[PDB]
């Protein structure tokens, strides 16, 4: 009865939205960038190799100074490295070893991590006495934590396998806001440059744009075939890129409200695990299950280069805020720095 | 540049302290063995825990050897993302309630989950210890033939007990036939793939406090031995 009527309403609304999207698609990105000169050959080399993790690494994050970084391994360790001179700055043992994400605060005073324990732990690095200690444990998710990112020293946004996202207040330790609407595990998130919006990707093959203050979804983007594993904004904040289990990467425009370009090749049949842009946004770097990383031309969808120095699955990737270097982490327990 | 030299010296000293601590932690990590316990709603995994958040941990020791077993707590029933965390464990312990052949078909669901685990690309080197639990209920249901194993598994008509079967004392031949048919169902999946990189170790359990941990200990020893033997081209 009413359920069938609601289904019909939903189908008609989807048809209308698709019609509007087709109406706005007057041209493509390939036709417009036809006369642009190619980047050429990108040949990056390994400058550092950071050793010391006992088991596979899942996550890393650069500090805002573009020198220090933090890495998380499922041996139970969070390690903070000085990428200059390779020396280890900190080594934090965790209560639970099944960590799946880590984040480094922009101020440089805190780090965060979580995983299969369904808890987000905050560690203070600038304590007066003794080594680093846990300062806060955010609980309330009913599934594993997949990603976290600091907004300020007092705000953090987390994504979970319970199909929701949350915005916390660190001092009180309570969920300030909850973001619902996804139907699968939320695998990744990325904050906008102004920290007013953020995007999330889930195991329902869809991405969502969320307003931080109002706590509501602005736009939904479809076009992938399988689960979305990674996501990141374009430098100007008007577009973003997604990597999927369907062995493709995709570019979506916020104002055009649809997909712009697809990056794929016939010989790539493995999933993407991580994506990132270069400083100017011309290059798109993607990590793959076939042990390698690909450097794509973001405007012409041509493969410009390959980073091929890992013996196991590439799990995480990150570009410094100054655009000087790229860092890759792998299941072989090593971290590599490229430029 | 003097303060720069002092900063380098302090950073190096901190790095050496961290590296010594990491050496100790590496020793500890290599010593212990990690297990993943996976069951079902009423498979009896809690009894296995009793014999002895998002994840629960049980620690035990056999012959001065340390085992840490992890069981999933508050996670959703979709596993294809978090199961990947357990590609480095020494074994997955898979608990199956064998009496519930008549969701109304739980044995088939267990077989599907076993097939998915066995054929996952990231678990290609992980061995499975299979615990077929609740043998008393299976015997009681077989003897009182109210519900037939047939017409849920039509092949059971053409099944004969293996000549190498070792029945427990005081077992009707029908109960032995049923047990070994159920075990052969899993062996059909586990012996078709692997190329000798990982194996399945099935056991029959009803209720023993100290036999199950001994079985796990022996299975882990066999797993390590077979890996070493395969390294040396003796297997």
């Amino acid at each position, epitope marked *: 009865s009413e359920l069938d009527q609601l*289904r019909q309403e939903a189908e008609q609304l*989807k048809n209308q939205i698709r019609d509007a999207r087709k109406a706005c698609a007057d041209a493509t990105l390939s036709q417009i960038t036809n006369n642009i000169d190619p980047v050429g050959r990108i040949q990056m080399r390994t400058r550092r190799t950071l050793r010391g993790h006992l088991a596979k690494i899942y996550a890393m994050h650069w500090g805002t100074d573009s020198r220090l970084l933090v890495s998380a391994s499922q041996d139970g360790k969070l390690i903070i490295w000085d990428s200059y001179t390779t020396n280890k700055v900190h080594a934090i043992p965790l209560r639970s070893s099944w960590v799946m994400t880590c984040a480094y605060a922009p101020s440089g005073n805190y780090v965060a991590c979580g995983g299969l324990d369904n808890i987000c732990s905050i560690y203070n690095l600038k304590t007066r006495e003794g080594n680093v200690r846990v300062s806060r444990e955010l609980a309330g998710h009913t599934g594993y934590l997949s990603c976290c990112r600091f907004l300020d020293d007092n705000q953090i946004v987390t994504s979970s396998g319970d199909t929701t996202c949350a915005l916390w207040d660190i001092e009180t330790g309570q969920q300030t806001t909850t973001f619902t609407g996804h*139907t*699968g595990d939320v695998m990744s998130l990325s904050l906008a440059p102004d920290t007013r919006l953020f995007v999330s990707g889930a*195991c*329902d*093959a*869809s991405a969502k744009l969320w307003d931080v203050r109002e706590g509501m979804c602005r736009q939904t983007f*479809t*076009g992938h*075939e*399988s*689960d979305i594993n990674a996501i990141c904004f374009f430098p100007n904040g008007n577009a973003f890129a997604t990597g999927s*289990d*369907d*062995a493709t990467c995709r570019l979506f425009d916020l104002r055009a409200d649809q997909e712009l370009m697809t990056y794929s090749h016939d010989n790539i*049949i493995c*999933g993407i695990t991580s994506v990132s842009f270069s400083k100017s946004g011309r290059l798109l770097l993607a990590g793959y299950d076939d042990f390698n990383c690909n450097v794509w031309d973001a405007l012409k969808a041509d493969r410009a280069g390959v980073l091929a120095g890992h013996d196991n699955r590439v799990s995480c990737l990150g570009v410094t805020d100054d655009g000087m270097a790229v860092a890759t982490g792998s299941w072989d327990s090593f971290l590599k720095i490229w430029n | 540049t003097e303060d720069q030299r002092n900063e380098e010296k302090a950073q190096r000293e901190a790095n050496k302290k961290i590296e010594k601590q990491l050496q100790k932690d590496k020793q500890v990590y290599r010593a212990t063995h990690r297990l993943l316990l996976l069951g079902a709603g009423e498979s009896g995994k809690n009894t296995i825990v009793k014999q002895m958040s998002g994840i629960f941990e049980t620690k035990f020791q056999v012959d001065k050897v340390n085992f840490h077993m992890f069981d999933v707590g508050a996670q*959703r*029933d*979709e*596993r*294809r993302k978090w*199961i990947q965390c357990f590609n480095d464990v020494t074994a997955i312990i898979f608990v199956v309630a064998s009496s519930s052949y008549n*969701q*109304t*078909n739980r044995l*088939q*669901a267990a077989l*599907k989950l076993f*097939d*998915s*685990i066995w*054929n*996952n*690309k990231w678990l290609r080197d992980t061995s499975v210890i299979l615990f077929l639990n609740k043998q008393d209920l299976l015997a009681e249901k077989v003897l009182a033939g109210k519900s037939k194993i047939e*017409d*849920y*598994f*039509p092949e059971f008509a053409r099944y004969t007990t293996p000549e190498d079967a070792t029945p427990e004392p005081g077992e009707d031949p029908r109960v032995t036939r049923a047990k070994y048919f159920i075990r052969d169902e899993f062996l059909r999946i586990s012996t078709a793939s692997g190329d000798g990189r990982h194996y399945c170790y099935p056991h029959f359990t009803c209720a023993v406090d100290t036999e199950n941990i001994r079985r796990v200990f022996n299975d882990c020893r066999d797993i390590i031995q077979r890996m070493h033997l395969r390294q040396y081209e003796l297997l």
Partner: nanobody
Amino acid sequence: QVQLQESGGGLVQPGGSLRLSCAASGFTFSNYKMNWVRQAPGKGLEWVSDISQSGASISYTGSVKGRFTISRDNAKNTLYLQMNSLKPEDTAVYYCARCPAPFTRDCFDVTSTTYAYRGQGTQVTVSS
């Protein structure tokens, strides 16, 4: 957007025959293994049948062997289930389900509650 629509089904007397169709859109059909799953009144989801990418490998659950046949046509992106000798135990809602990822042999969560890559299902009732 991934989309699966199931059609066919209705009232049928015991011993009758029926055909269910599944039309797929939004993905490369030939790269995925496919599944038929069912949910009976007041029971959980139950796996029924599956067919591989090229259709060479086919599997059925024990209680439907000899009565159900699964088929697929990659050219028209369609999946078919032919049901023969129906019984009142077959009254249920039938769903068409896709493997989560392409180019894989494992198929994890097709019978889970709120699985993403599943259709809305069609009702089959067997009564005299």
